[PDB]
Ligand binder design. Structure first.
Ligand SMILES: Nc1ncnc2c1ncn2[C@@H]1O[C@H](COP(=O)(O)OP(=O)(O)NP(=O)(O)O)[C@@H](O)[C@H]1O
Ligand SMILES: Nc1ncnc2c1ncn2[C@@H]1O[C@H](COP(=O)(O)OP(=O)(O)O)[C@@H](O)[C@H]1O
Ligand SMILES: [Mg+2]
Ligand SMILES: [Mg+2]
Lengths: 293, 269
């Protein structure tokens, strides 16, 4: 009369989930809004600790539906579990009628917006570095066996022009040992198999990565604009992919269309991507032709 | 599942064990009609504050309480009506779970802790499936039958009296509303007691400060031995909206899932 043991032999998750009261932080301005809820920029002042920390406060709008917040609590779980310079970490949550995730603020915010507003003051060596940092972040996410099912430029935040991080995690799912695939959403960033069969893997996030780098190399252009979510499956079956960005050389575009291969194993790994983009970043003007540099 | 009725002369109170919020518990004895045998029992005396002269006859909030039996609840052997209501149960010498975890602390296995979580959960499930609301679940009210078996006590006692703050849900504090999910809140606090090895909830604070503190978003902090996965459970227990909170079926099942791997979810050395 005890439960019989079947040990997993996996390490305990000793992530600290800090809980804060709403009076510990103030809301200054709105950064983002939608049906998800609202992201605020505000100031956190811990109790007895006197540091003032610029923070983003994400608050969920449909408090009452159970799994809107089941999804918020999974999100909070993941964000509290990760630890990496290129992934955004949870600083704690406030439990009220409304759940409020609290993260460290990133002054320059969305990276998509950044490569759009600053279109022509951006050299090759910033873009390649960004690609490297994102690949590193996704590599860390990969070896913690969680899949970021929503990798895109929208979801990359900018701490400094030289330092970006990864966010969201609202769709991100954890894979157990001998859980290679996830069976379950932004259609123009997903792998073909994620559209056709709802399968998500680490190799699907590589497709998302390719589309992301394409967004960056086109300075925040819209993927397949004018093309609706309805038909893209078909275009991908005809072999049609995203166009070669004007600044990209044949090698860079080779790598990104390599991310968009049908066979998911034929696609590069984040390890590989870190290596190759680091190698390109050591001589940026040879791989990206952007003059004004 | 059948309620026994005693007469007042069959019962005798030997020593006071302690008093709580509702009644006073005596270690006493049972001597049946026309017999000379003394059988050690636990007699809880509840005073009649109804004014209608409540307890002279068996009501069936009373048979309802008396008609419940489960492996992980304290069975009510019998009741005795009068000016004071007397609830007779088994005398469990091992005492409360609170005192046990306080005395042995980390020395108890993580398997034991997770399992006790499960047991308390299935006891509460039995109670909820039979429409019984506890209204006073705590570590002090979980007694040890065996070194490995625990039982839920003092259930249904609260609606014997007319219309503990640290184990109560917000709606209970604000509006005197008690639900099975308020019992879930209480369960969460109880488990917090368990895995902190008998810590006092909101120690530094004062009773006045607690409900508002809750409404401002803060909770009982993550226990030192608790993985994020186990603390997440207590967290969802302490949700403000009731229908978000877990049910006892799920609580039992997930603590079972954890019990099938004690070291992955609790870290004690
Ligand atoms: N079946 C039992 N066997 C042994 N001791 C018991 C039993 N039931 C209750 N007690 C003891 O009774 C004492 C006080 O009773 P009581 O006041 O009803 O419980 P409590 O701990 O104060 N919790 P509560 O009154 O519901 O807020 C405690 O020290 C318990 O250990
Ligand atoms: N910490 C932050 N610092 C700056 N901007 C942020 C921060 N968090 C979110 N944002 C803004 O919100 C958007 C990203 O939030 P995200 O988590 O993707 O919301 P959702 O998950 O609802 O899409 C970006 O456009 C960004 O400008
Ligand atoms: Mg988004
Ligand atoms: Mg008691």
């Amino acid at each position: 009369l005890v439960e019989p043991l079947t040990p997993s032999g996996e390490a305990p998750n000793q992530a600290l989930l800090r809980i804060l009261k709403e009076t510990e932080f103030k809301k200054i301005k709105v950064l983002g809004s939608g049906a998800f809820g609202t992201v605020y920029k505000g100031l956190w002042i811990p109790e007895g600790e006197k540091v003032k920390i610029p923070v983003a406060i994400k608050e969920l709008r449909e408090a009452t539906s159970p799994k809107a917040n089941k999804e918020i609590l999974d999100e909070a779980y993941v964000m509290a579990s990760v630890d990496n310079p290129h992934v955004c970490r949870l600083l704690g949550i406030c439990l009220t009628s409304t759940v409020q995730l609290i993260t460290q603020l990133m002054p320059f915010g969305c990276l998509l917006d950044y490569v759009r507003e600053h279109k022509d003051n951006i050299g090759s060596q910033y873009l390649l570095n960004w690609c490297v940092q994102i690949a590193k972040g996704m590599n860390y996410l990969e070896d913690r066996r969680l899949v970021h099912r929503d990798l895109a430029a929208r979801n990359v935040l900018v701490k400094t022009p030289q330092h970006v991080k990864i966010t969201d995690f609202g769709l991100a799912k954890l894979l157990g040992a001998e859980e290679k695939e996830y069976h379950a959403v932004p259609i123009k960033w997903m792998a073909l198999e994620s559209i056709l069969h709802r399968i998500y893997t680490h190799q699907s996030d590589v497709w998302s990565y390719g589309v992301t780098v394409w967004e960056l190399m086109t300075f925040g252009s819209k993927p397949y604009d004018g093309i609706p979510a309805s038909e893209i499956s078909s275009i991908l079956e005809k072999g049609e992919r995203l166009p070669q960005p004007p600044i990209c050389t044949i090698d860079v575009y080779m790598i990104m269309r390599k991310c968009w291969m049908i066979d998911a194993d034929s696609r590069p790994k984040f390890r590989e991507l870190i290596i190759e983009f680091s190698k390109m970043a050591r001589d940026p003007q040879r791989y990206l032709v952007i003059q004004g540099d | 599942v059948l309620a026994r009725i005693f007469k007042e002369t069959e019962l005798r109170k030997l020593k006071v064990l302690g008093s709580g919020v509702f009644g006073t518990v005596h270690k006493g004895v049972w001597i049946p009609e026309g017999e000379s045998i003394k059988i050690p029992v636990c007699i809880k005396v509840i005073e009649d504050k109804s004014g209608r002269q409540s307890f002279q006859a068996v009501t069936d909030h009373m048979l309802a309480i008396g008609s419940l039996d489960h492996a992980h609840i304290v069975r009510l052997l019998g009741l005795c009506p009068g000016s004071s209501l007397q609830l007779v149960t088994q005398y469990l010498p091992l005492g409360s779970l609170l005192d046990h975890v306080r005395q042995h602390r980390g020395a108890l296995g993580p398997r034991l802790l997770l399992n006790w979580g499960v047991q308390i959960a299935k006891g509460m499930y039995y109670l909820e499936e039979h429409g019984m609301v506890h209204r006073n679940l705590a570590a002090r009210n979980v007694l040890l039958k065996s070194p490995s078996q625990v039982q839920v006590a003092d259930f249904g006692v609260a609606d014997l009296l007319p219309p503990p703050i640290k184990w109560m849900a917000l709606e209970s504090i604000h509006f005197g509303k008690y639900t099975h999910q308020s019992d879930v809140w209480s369960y969460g606090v109880t488990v917090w007691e368990l895995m902190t090895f008998g810590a006092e909830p909101y120690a530094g604070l004062r009773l006045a400060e607690v409900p508002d503190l809750l409404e401002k978003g803060e909770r009982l902090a993550q226990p030192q031995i608790c993985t994020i996965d186990v603390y997440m459970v207590m967290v969802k227990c302490w949700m403000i909206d009731e229908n978000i909170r877990p049910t006892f079926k799920e609580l039992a099942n997930e603590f079972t899932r954890m019990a099938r791997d004690p070291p992955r979810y609790l870290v004690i050395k």
